[PDB]
Amino acid sequence: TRKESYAIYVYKVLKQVHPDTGISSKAMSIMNSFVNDVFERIAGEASRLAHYNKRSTITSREIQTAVRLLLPGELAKHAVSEGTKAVTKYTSAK
Amino acid sequence: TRKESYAIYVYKVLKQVHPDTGISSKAMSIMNSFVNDVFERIAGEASRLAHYNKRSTITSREIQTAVRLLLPGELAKHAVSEGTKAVTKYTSAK
Amino acid sequence: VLRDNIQGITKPAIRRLARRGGVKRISGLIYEETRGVLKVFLENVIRDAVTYTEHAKRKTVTAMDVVYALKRQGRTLYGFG
Amino acid sequence: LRDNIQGITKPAIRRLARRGGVKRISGLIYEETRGVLKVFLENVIRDAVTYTEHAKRKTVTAMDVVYALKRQGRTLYGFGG
Amino acid sequence: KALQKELEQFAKLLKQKRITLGYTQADVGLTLGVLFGKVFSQTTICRFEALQLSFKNMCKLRPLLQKWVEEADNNENLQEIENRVRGNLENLFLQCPKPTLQQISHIAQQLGLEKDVVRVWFCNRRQKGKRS
Amino acid sequence: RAKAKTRSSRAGLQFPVGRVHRLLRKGNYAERVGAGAPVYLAAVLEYLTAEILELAGNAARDNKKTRIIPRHLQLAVRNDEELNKLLGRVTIAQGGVLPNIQSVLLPK
Amino acid sequence: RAKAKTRSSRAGLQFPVGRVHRLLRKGNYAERVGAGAPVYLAAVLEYLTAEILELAGNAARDNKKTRIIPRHLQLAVRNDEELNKLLGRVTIAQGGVLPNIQSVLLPK
Amino acid sequence: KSAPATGGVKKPHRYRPGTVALREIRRYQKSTELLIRKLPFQRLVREIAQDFKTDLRFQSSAVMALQEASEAYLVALFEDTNLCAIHAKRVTIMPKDIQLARRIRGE
Amino acid sequence: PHRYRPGTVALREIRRYQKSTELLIRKLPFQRLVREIAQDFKTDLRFQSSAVMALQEASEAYLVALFEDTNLCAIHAKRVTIMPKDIQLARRIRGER
DNA sequence: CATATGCTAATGTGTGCATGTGTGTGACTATGTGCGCATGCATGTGCATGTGTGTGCATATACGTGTGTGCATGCATGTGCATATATGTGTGCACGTGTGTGTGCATGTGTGTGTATGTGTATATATTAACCTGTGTGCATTGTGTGCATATATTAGCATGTGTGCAT
DNA sequence: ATGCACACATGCTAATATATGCACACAATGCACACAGGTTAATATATACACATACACACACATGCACACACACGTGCACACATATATGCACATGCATGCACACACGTATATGCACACACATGCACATGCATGCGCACATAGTCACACACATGCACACATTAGCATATG
């Protein structure tokens, strides 16, 4: 059947940052592993944050707090900025 | 309000193993923390096991495999024996 | 609160901690080094605990915030909830 | 399959030490390294086989090994997880 | 400088203590030997008390005598308890001023003298002949 | 109807089977929870509690104490190989350390 | 209906917002997921991917390569302090190590 | 001059270096109480926290948990540091011992 | 006959193997070892080739990191040759004991 | 017998030459690097397609806001005394040096085992479809667990004896 | 072997932290009931294993030796120990605020379900970049030969101190 992965999105990002640079299949697998790992870490932290506060929904606030908990200083600041900007643009465009 | 803990059940277990031995409040708090920690570890491992195998139910099989993964050898064997015995008695009585 | 409270971790206290660790002889440069290490450790835990406190929209750091921060760092602590 | 630990030869252990930046190696290193690798492989393979049993399979997959490594705090990238 | 007069004063007082303690100069050398190990001959003590020795030697023997006079005052009882060879060697000179060790051994065996004694005497013969 | 009896008594356990089931259901672990899973988990938790409590009671008796304190729990955990492995990254408050002096530091 | 616009294009993102939302829903994290949570998470994942890919592309360009291989990802991660902290317990397959010889081992 | 010999011998005698250290090792490995004074540690915690949020409050049990964790961390680090010092055929722990222990631990 | 002094080609190999990324253990003996170890847990066990490759990658990464820590322990003791006690110390500090 | 002399064995201080050792500066030798040319497979582009996501209402409910309450935190005040600190001393530990040995490195050689290719078979993994049993939902019943008070046994604080180990 | 300092053992009081009890309320249980996830039987295919072959490179073994390490020794200074003084921690109260929690209402929002399309994935070539190989440049390593330094020994240059005999 169909095995979903992040390969096409990673390729789009790579073309955004390095239009003339390709990527090998093993490197693509490593990038897919990295995306899944970071997703699992952030989602687990946000789930625990919702549980600690007796909340049943995971919102962008929980994601922001999980990102701050899991990421080192400058990475956390820049990731929080990107997430906030994306959420603002999304709600501005419904 | 009411705060739930394992203190009374830990006390019953203590009275069975050591009928004439008490426990301090700090030691009871530590026992509560230990029970919660082991519960969270086992339940998280069982949840991951269910997700890996494309299942939506946590069954006693997932719990048994999580116990085998998380507990060291002899502890794991005795815990598996206790859990199997309890499930067998529960099914035979209901 | 105050300023420069790392000196409050005195040389005798560091010596007692080293004795509990089974250390027989301590060089004079250890204490300062120890202080730095402690500060780093605390800076990593408190920063996380406050983050938890900030998420709950509280102004008081609770024992549970510290416990969650310690668990987040792989240093789970029993006896405080 | 009997006594396959000696298949981890002296030159292979020396190459592994060179990648680790080691310049000089005592003659007793090789047996200790074989024991260390044997223990590591026991732990990982035991967890991977447990994952294989839970799936009711008879083939150890790459995902079983990846999950076993992740459970031990040794996350590996590049094999589907 | 004034070390000369300080040595002289010390030596006069040393003579006074030696005469007061009833010790002969040979006995002084014996005491120095049994308390330090470097026994000195009574000629050295004579030349000291008369201030005949050289300045470097003067300073060199100052400390030993200082220690002896500062220590012996406590208890005394336990502390108390050839020409033909010359002529032959001169005959051996006037022909070979600096003989080899091979000849030196023969000379030593001939006149019954120790090898080191003959060697040092040969060196001093050369020395006094090179004076002039 | 019939006189209600807890699932803990049905399973012959002291730990609360119903509470474990509720904690599994509301803990966001899976969409569904089987009937035998809370029983198995409660039995395992009770067994581990019993092991640690019996070792800690032995440690308290060795100290002529009738009440278990955090020191006894720490001694029981650290003196047991498998329990020490299970709680390797765990700090027990007011537990102290095992008495251990390296032989090189002992007097000659 | 109007023309169907993907939520990723609405949020200005390359990573799939809908897939992230579905994975959050079926991942057993909470019984409800907010509308902005998958958007925030997808944006964060895209940012981290972009950082790593930019560093790895620079590493590949340094080695006169047009294609990123695991070695370039390893060099990018380990040479960046923050990424190295984030991935400190992660092994990258076929990544090798960083060239490092202790100065005491060098000839004098 | 005067006379040699002379006493001056510092009669006062004491315990040998390391005997009291071993006694303190046994004493503090037997006990469980906190080895850092509570008030200075609380002041240090508040001063460190003031850099993250202004006008923070602390539960007493929060500071107690912080102190328990900090002392456990430091004692374990000192055990590792002692192992490193003994490895170098010494009995005195030095800052390089702490640095090596923290490097190996992954800190 | 030319002879390099001790430690020269050792440093050459350090540079060579820190420049490369290929597996350093032979694949077939490692596969035999993996199957031999897995026999003690099950009989008639089959392995995906990618599973054995993942095991080898993890094993070599673990051993290389251990050798780095062991080298640090050896240098700490003012030596340049790693010894079994260095490995034991590194594993004890790491908590792998 | 004990001092003063003349005199010369004996040692002691200094050059220094000559020899031996260690060092330093640049030919052979080996090895890693950098183009240059040719190949293969592996990456990237282009299509069917079917599955998952977007759209649209309709419903439920979780959470955010607002009010009121009581705990509990921070601050100030006061206390004795246990602890920290600065000082002086001496010891034994760390470090530096020197050395001898044997262990480990560099190298050469013969081989046998790993590697890559190729094949085929069976075993097992994955997929599909019917079904049925176990689990979620909802609601009434109520029995268990928790919070708030008592009552007490255990633990903590001293005072003398008791070995117990250290150090001269 | 004896003296001294320290941790422990028996014993007695005192309190505070634990064990037990009673009331209420909330979550566990019991009972239908619906439904979908999981089970099971059959089947199609993927792929792992087992064998077979040739080849060549890496491994194993033996050799020669260099330098790293373990041991020994000397030393100086850094740190342990003891002491006298003073600081500030611990305790203990008491007060006021402020903030964390409870509770309730009511809406914004997440879910649910059905449909429709377009996005992502499997499959298919196409080509071009990474790899492989032979040549040549190109960096570094290691004697080599020499040069400089340092020892020592040893020769030779001064001082030194004891003998035989002279005084006395």
Residue numbers in the entry:
A (entry chain H), B (entry chain D): 29 to 122
C (entry chain F): 21 to 101
D (entry chain B): 22 to 102
E (entry chain X): 140 to 220, 238 to 288
F (entry chain C), G (entry chain G): 11 to 118
H (entry chain E): 27 to 133
I (entry chain A): 38 to 134
Excerpt from the publication:
Multiple transcription factors can bind together to a regulatory element in a cooperative way, and cooperation between the pioneer transcription factors OCT4 (also known as POU5F1) and SOX2 is important for pluripotency and reprogramming. Here we present cryo-electron microscopy structures of human OCT4 bound to a nucleosome containing human LIN28B or nMATN1 DNA sequences, both of which bear multiple binding sites for OCT4. Our structural and biochemistry data reveal that binding of OCT4 induces changes to the nucleosome structure, repositions the nucleosomal DNA and facilitates cooperative binding of additional OCT4 and of SOX2 to their internal binding sites. OCT4 has two DNA-binding domains: OCT4-POUS and OCT4-POUHD.
Our structural and MNase sequencing data revealed that, despite the presence of multiple OCT4 motifs in the nMATN1 DNA, OCT4 predominantly binds to one binding site in the linker DNA, near the nucleosome entry–exit site (mOBS1), a position overall similar to that in the LIN28B nucleosome structure. Both DNA-binding domains of OCT4 engage the nMATN1 nucleosome; whereas OCT4-POUHD is bound close to the nucleosome dyad, OCT4-POUS is located distally from the nucleosome. Nevertheless, despite its distal position relative to the nMATN1 nucleosome, OCT4-POUS interacts with the histone H3 tail via a smaller acidic patch of OCT4 formed by the side chains of helices 4 and 5. Of note, the H3 tail from the entry–exit site opposite to the OCT4-binding side interacts with OCT4, in contrast to the LIN28B nucleosome. OCT4 interaction with the H3 tail in the nMATN1 nucleosome prompted us to test whether H3K27 modifications also modulate histone cooperativity on this human sequence, as it does for the LIN28B sequence. We found that both H3K27ac and H3K27me3 modifications increased binding of the second and especially the third OCT4. Of note, our data show that H3K27 modifications did not affect the binding of the first OCT4 to the LIN28B or nMATN1 nucleosome, but it altered the cooperative binding of additional OCT4 or of SOX2 to nucleosomal internal sites.
